[PDB]
Amino acid sequence: EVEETLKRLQSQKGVQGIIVVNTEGIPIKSTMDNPTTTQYASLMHSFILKARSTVRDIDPQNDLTFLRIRSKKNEIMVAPDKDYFLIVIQNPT
């Protein structure tokens, strides 16, 4: 359930990229090229960890579970978990 899951969620409402994070957003499984998938997933991973640190600065016993940025050109629905800081690059529809 790797490539079929890839195409399954990429064939949704304009999902430009989705990979469940192995560790620090760099899996071999790339839905797009090296920057958009690997580098940008790593940036969303470390910076969503910084967002975890933000809520941690607000409430240290409150890590992050999800993120949702549905706007003009994307529906970024990032979900940090125990092993993955989920990456979603989407379209508004």
């Binding site: 790797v2 192995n22 092993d83």
Partner: peptide
């Protein structure tokens, strides 16, 4: 490289949880 937990069934459970989070 990352083939350790990329083809395993636990990663398929992570895929199911990712799809479950999106949906």
């Amino acid at each position: 490289e990352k083939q350790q937990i990329l083809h395993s069934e636990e990663f398929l459970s992570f895929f199911d949880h990712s799809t479950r989070i999106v949906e």
